[PDB]
Amino acid sequence: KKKGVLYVGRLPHGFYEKQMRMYFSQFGPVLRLRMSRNRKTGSSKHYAFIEFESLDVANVVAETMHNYLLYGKLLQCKVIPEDQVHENMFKGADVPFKRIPHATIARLQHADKLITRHNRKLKLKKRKL
């Protein structure tokens, strides 16, 4: 019934959304999982939030996956308080990850108004000088 949000911490590199969802679905259905990722680069912030179908299963996975030594990291599995569970708790959850190739986007992006702005900037630099 109550839709238990079981968090996972100390996630080894590679234990990403696909691997977590597959592993944690084995214990119980993982409705939504959104592994935290950086806004710029989408590097796994190394913690995720699993909304197990039942609070019971989330609690069961908590006890069995807490202090779990996975590749040198003691997985911190503590069921997220349902009262503290937010609405933006799972905003855009389970999405194919979209770190735009900003570096290329700015790079492909590379007239008279720009020249005027440069002249104004030069005038501002002269004023500062």
Binding site: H13, G14, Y16, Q26
Partner: peptide, 23 residues
């Protein structure tokens, strides 16, 4: 049921294969 160690090892292998293919 299979352990989560196999999941991460498979991902690192896939990333390892992706990296070599890009080579």
């Amino acid at each position: 049921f299979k352990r989560a160690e196999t999941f991460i090892n498979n991902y690192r292998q896939r990333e390892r294969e992706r990296i070599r293919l890009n080579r």
